[PDB]
Ligand binder design. Structure first.
Ligand SMILES: [Mg+2]
Ligand SMILES: [Mg+2]
Ligand SMILES: [Mg+2]
Ligand SMILES: [Mg+2]
Ligand SMILES: [Mg+2]
Ligand SMILES: [Mg+2]
Ligand SMILES: [Mg+2]
Ligand SMILES: [Mg+2]
Ligand SMILES: [Mg+2]
Ligand SMILES: [Mg+2]
Ligand SMILES: [Mg+2]
Ligand SMILES: [Mg+2]
Ligand SMILES: [Mg+2]
Ligand SMILES: [Mg+2]
Ligand SMILES: [Mg+2]
Ligand SMILES: [Mg+2]
Ligand SMILES: [Mg+2]
Ligand SMILES: [Mg+2]
Ligand SMILES: [Mg+2]
Ligand SMILES: [Mg+2]
Ligand SMILES: [Mg+2]
Ligand SMILES: [Mg+2]
Ligand SMILES: [Mg+2]
Ligand SMILES: [Mg+2]
Ligand SMILES: [Mg+2]
Ligand SMILES: [Mg+2]
Ligand SMILES: [Mg+2]
Ligand SMILES: [Mg+2]
Ligand SMILES: [Mg+2]
Ligand SMILES: [Mg+2]
Ligand SMILES: [Mg+2]
Ligand SMILES: [Mg+2]
Ligand SMILES: [Mg+2]
Ligand SMILES: [Mg+2]
Ligand SMILES: [Mg+2]
Ligand SMILES: [Mg+2]
Ligand SMILES: [Mg+2]
Ligand SMILES: [Mg+2]
Ligand SMILES: [Mg+2]
Ligand SMILES: [Zn+2]
Lengths: 97, 52, 77, 135, 91, 252
RNA sequence: UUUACUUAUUCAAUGAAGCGGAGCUGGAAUUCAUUUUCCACGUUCUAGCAUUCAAGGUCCCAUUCGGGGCUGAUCCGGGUU
RNA sequence: UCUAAGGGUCGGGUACGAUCAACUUAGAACUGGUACGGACAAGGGGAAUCUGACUGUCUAAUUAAAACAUAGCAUUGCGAUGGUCAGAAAGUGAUGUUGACGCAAU
RNA sequence: GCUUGUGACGGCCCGUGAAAAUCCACAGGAAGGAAUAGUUUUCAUGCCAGGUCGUACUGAUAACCGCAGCAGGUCUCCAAG
RNA sequence: GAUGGGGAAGCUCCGUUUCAAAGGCCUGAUUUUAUGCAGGCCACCAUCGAAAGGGAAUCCGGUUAAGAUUCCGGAACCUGG
């Protein structure tokens, strides 16, 4: 599933976590896909969306809170947004997403 | 406050001595996006009307 | 109520239309750690502030006093 | 792309010029012994052209349409890159690193940039850029 | 060291009012002082501030809720009822 | 004898409401052109305790359609509504907790609060913490809507009368024992001067029908007629039955 | 006696603001000659912004700066609802 | 009259030193006409019966109580064109800035 | 250390603990403004004026109320070893 | 607690923004002239009620038989112009 694809990304690719860095990543044309927590406030969501479209980057809307997004990336804190810099051995990039 | 010069009652930004700055960051961002999404909203329903 | 330190600024004060009177006070005081030395405070009374200028150098002191406007009503001590 | 480049319009988001709109004229994507941050060199509009109408005649229009410009070194993280873009060739040379340092160099620059923007504005190229963002 | 065998917070009333009244109060006190999950920012930082008012330490949103608990059974069934009924109208 | 306690209440000298800390009266918007042809948006700005009340109030602000300014309104907050939330009021509004719609626009089964008894009266029914009314049917000809009040009563009102979706916040307030006299003290200190309460059976005859006797006791039936007279109505007024209620109540 | 009416009387509301009747357009709708009708007829991802008789259009004053009409904002009835 | 325990501040390449300033607590000697919380200050205790649960309250000036109150329990009225109450009357008034998780009455 | 002030926090509530005058700020951009010289009194300095009534003392085992220079009653601030 | 009002034989009782045609500011228009009209607003509809609540601004030293943050000396500050 999407989490298992995520979990592959995490253990074989490159990624950054959290608002500020995925904007650095978005500016630098580096992000290959961003994943957005169900409950991040619409304004941030709106902005990451504007940053993404300016950089021709695809967005995924994670069915679930920042609490669970962080468990999906195998981490014990919570994350509101994720940036794939490199699909590792996974295929998240070229599947449904 | 009437006994005291204007620079003691402002900071030199938009909404100076009134709103809090991180508050004005928010206002600006939200304004821009919403004014943009407005053009987005219009062009969709201009398209709905001609594809119906 | 107000202190002053620019010895040019001061001279201008003393000639400011509203400045009728002034006073000069002399204070024994001690230097660094050891010896003493003669301190002098020039006080110019303006309409709403008493401006006072402290000259520690007894030498600038003497010369300054000669520079005092010859119509001003100085109070010595 | 690396979308922060040679002609991007952006909204300033912090500090005095906050909320005003700029063009990037020269990007410093990473580095500077001074400014240790990604930062752009922008020319923006500080005092916008006030609106003008049919009632406005003679030299009231002339007054109404004056533009006060500004130039700024500003950290990337304080700009909202915009989808719009405005051509920057007529004052490429003018907004320089050397332009900052020495006030007199700054004032000269704005003189040019101001003449540039008032040209642009009359016969309304870049229409959006000359109308105040409200918030 | 476990300090009380069963009166918990209700220890403060000593011996007064009858064990069963203290039982009833204990339940709603635990309910009412507890820290809750914020729906909006996802931190557990919603504490009460006078019956029905529930507000978040950071992020600072306030949510009208039950007198002693953020969400009421009744409130919640109603929330889904409304949901169900709403969805009939654009469907 | 003398005027009894329940007659003195009416002149309300020391019996008026303790009103100083109150936030102001809770009311829906005035029923204007907006609310009655379309919808109008506000923002809940603040949800706040009102002394003497159980349910919190929600301060909600709307633009004035006819003048440049903000007009603030005092709602009773429904469970679930929150600061920053957008509130939609009007005929053409949509079925969300917090919005305010005329009962004619909401399907049978809808749950609502603060509903009007006539359109525009700005809200009368189901305001106390936890309460609500259920819509149980419509009669589109002569637009009426049948609802069921907290009390159990059914009543039909105009389909234009308005209501706000959901239940009033603060529920279960009464599940918790007061425990001490003092909490009732502070309870009634912010309401009105009705506490504590001497039993009439502890007063003298001058004072009350129940007063007097060499043992405490009422000495005649304590169920009093409807058509009894001021000074006589103490006890179980117009009581159609009496005694421990046995078995399921529940309006059928 | 029933059940209709509204101007008496009665109750609420609002700084008496958008009522009633028609018309424009969109269209569901099915045409038994062509329309017989019924609905609509600017706002819902976001804790921004919304005011100077409105910009636009158009006609005047005798071209000065200023300023006015109409339109933008359909018509009719003055029953505030 | 002794002993022990409990702290501060400083320089240390990318183990300790130096000093200054506080009554607490415990242990050990000695000592006296066996005294020493030396004045002051400062709970009598126990076992049961009756009775009100408690805290609170009253008869100012013969009754402080087992009386009143109280939380808790139960019953009654009422959806506003209403219930309870006020007023000689009223385009009058209390509850009511209220609405059954409410107000009023036992 | 003692008294008082104050801060950052924490406990409590079916209790969540006034109002108005008044002062400022911001959004707005009507307007009014320069080169042969304009704008500026929220920067400094400078000029004039500020009426009317109370103001002593006691505040208690003698200045108050208890028929009184009554062992009674009568609100409060300061506080050494 | 006045007032348009409504009761009351009446002394008066009710009501306080109430079922009222409820009033004044900013400058422009004057260069007969002193202030008529020209805009646009603002509809807030009395007033009394705190010497402990709110609140513009002063201090030190000296001085009397008896006054003093009030006089004298010095040095400040606020409000209006
Ligand atoms: Mg400042
Ligand atoms: Mg500005
Ligand atoms: Mg009252
Ligand atoms: Mg009482
Ligand atoms: Mg009792
Ligand atoms: Mg009782
Ligand atoms: Mg008795
Ligand atoms: Mg009797
Ligand atoms: Mg009887
Ligand atoms: Mg009896
Ligand atoms: Mg009995
Ligand atoms: Mg109306
Ligand atoms: Mg030691
Ligand atoms: Mg007892
Ligand atoms: Mg007791
Ligand atoms: Mg007695
Ligand atoms: Mg006793
Ligand atoms: Mg006694
Ligand atoms: Mg019992
Ligand atoms: Mg009448
Ligand atoms: Mg004290
Ligand atoms: Mg608080
Ligand atoms: Mg301020
Ligand atoms: Mg004009
Ligand atoms: Mg000044
Ligand atoms: Mg005067
Ligand atoms: Mg005195
Ligand atoms: Mg005496
Ligand atoms: Mg005495
Ligand atoms: Mg009166
Ligand atoms: Mg007064
Ligand atoms: Mg006072
Ligand atoms: Mg005072
Ligand atoms: Mg003195
Ligand atoms: Mg004298
Ligand atoms: Mg004296
Ligand atoms: Mg003096
Ligand atoms: Mg002087
Ligand atoms: Mg002045
Ligand atoms: Zn939160």
């Amino acid at each position: 599933s999407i989490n298992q694809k995520l979990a592959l990304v995490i253990k074989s690719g490159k990624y950054t976590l959290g608002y500020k860095s995925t904007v650095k990543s978005l500016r630098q044309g580096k992000s290959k896909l961003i994943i957005i927590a169900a409950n991040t406030p619409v304004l941030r969501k709106s902005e990451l969306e504007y940053y993404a479209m300016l950089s021709k980057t695809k967005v995924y809307y994670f069915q679930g809170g920042n609490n669970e997004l962080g468990t999906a990336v195998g981490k014990l804190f919570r994350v509101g947004v994720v940036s794939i810099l490199e699909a590792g051995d996974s295929d998240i990039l070229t599947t449904l997403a | 406050y009437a006994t005291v010069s204007k620079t003691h009652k402002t900071v030199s930004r938009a909404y100076g001595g009134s709103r809090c700055a991180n508050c004005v960051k928010e206002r600006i961002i939200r304004a821009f996006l919403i004014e943009e999404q407005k053009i987005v909203k219009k062009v969709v329903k201009e398209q709905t009307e001609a594809a119906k | 109520a107000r202190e002053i330190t620019d010895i040019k600024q001061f001279l201008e004060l003393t000639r400011r239309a509203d400045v009728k009177t002034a006073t000069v006070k002399i204070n024994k005081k001690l230097n660094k750690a050891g010896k003493p030395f003669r301190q002098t405070k020039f006080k110019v009374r303006g309409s709403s502030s008493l401006y006072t200028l402290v000259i520690n150098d007894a030498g600038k002191a003497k010369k300054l006093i000669q520079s005092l406007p010859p119509t001003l009503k100085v109070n010595r001590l | 792309a690396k979308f922060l480049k040679a002609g991007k319009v952006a909204v300033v988001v912090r500090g005095r010029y906050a909320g005003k709109k700029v063009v990037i004229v020269k990007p410093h994507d990473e580095g500077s012994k001074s400014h240790p941050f990604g930062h752009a060199l922008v020319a923006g509009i500080e005092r916008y052209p006030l609106k003008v109408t049919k009632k406005h005649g003679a030299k009231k229009v002339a007054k109404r349409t004056k533009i006060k410009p500004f130039i700024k070194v500003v950290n990337y993280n304080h700009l909202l890159p915009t989808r719009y873009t405005l051509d920057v060739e007529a004052f490429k040379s003018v907004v320089s690193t050397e332009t900052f340092e020495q006030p007199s160099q700054r004032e000269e620059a704005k003189k040019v940039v101001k003449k540039a923007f008032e040209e642009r504005h009359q016969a309304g190229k870049n229409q959006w850029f000359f109308s105040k963002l409200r918030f | 060291a476990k300090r009380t065998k069963k009166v918990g917070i209700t220890g403060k009333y000593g011996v007064r009012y009858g064990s069963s009244l203290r039982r009833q109060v204990k339940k709603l006190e635990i309910q009412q002082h507890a820290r809750y999950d914020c729906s909006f920012c996802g931190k557990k930082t919603v504490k009460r501030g006078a019956a029905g008012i529930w507000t978040c330490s950071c992020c600072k949103k306030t949510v009208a809720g039950g007198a002693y608990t953020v969400s009421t059974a009744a409130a919640a069934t109603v929330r889904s009822t409304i949901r169900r009924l709403r969805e009939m109208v654009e469907a | 004898g003398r005027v009894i306690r329940n007659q003195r209440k009416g002149a309300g000298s020391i019996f008026t409401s303790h009103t100083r800390l109150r936030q102001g009266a809770a009311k829906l918007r005035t029923l204007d052109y907006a609310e009655r042809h379309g919808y109008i948006r506000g923002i809940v700005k603040q949800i706040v305790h009102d002394s003497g009340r159980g349910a919190p109030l929600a301060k909600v602000v709307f633009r004035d359609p006819y003048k440049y300014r903000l007009r603030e309104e005092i709602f009773i907050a429904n469970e679930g509504v929150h600061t920053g939330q957008f509130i939609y009021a009007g005929k053409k509004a949509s079925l969300n907790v917090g919005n305010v719609l005329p009962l004619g626009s909401v399907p049978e089964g809808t749950i609502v609060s603060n509903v009007e008894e006539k359109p525009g009266d700005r809200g009368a029914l189901a305001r106390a913490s936890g309460n609500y009314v259920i819509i149980i049917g419509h009669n589109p000809d002569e637009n009426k809507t049948r609802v069921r009040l907290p009390s159990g009563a059914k009543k039909v009102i105009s389909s234009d009368a308005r209501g706000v979706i959901g239940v009033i916040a603060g529920g279960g307030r009464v599940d918790k024992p007061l425990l001490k006299a003092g909490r009732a003290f502070h309870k009634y200190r912010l309401k009105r001067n009705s506490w504590p309460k001497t039993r009439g059976v502890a007063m003298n005859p001058v004072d009350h029908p129940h007063g007097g006797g060499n043992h405490q006791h009422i000495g005649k039936a304590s169920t009093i007629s409807r058509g009894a007279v001021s000074g006589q109505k103490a006890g179980l007024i117009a009581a159609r039955r009496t005694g421990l209620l046995r078995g399921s109540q529940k309006t059928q």
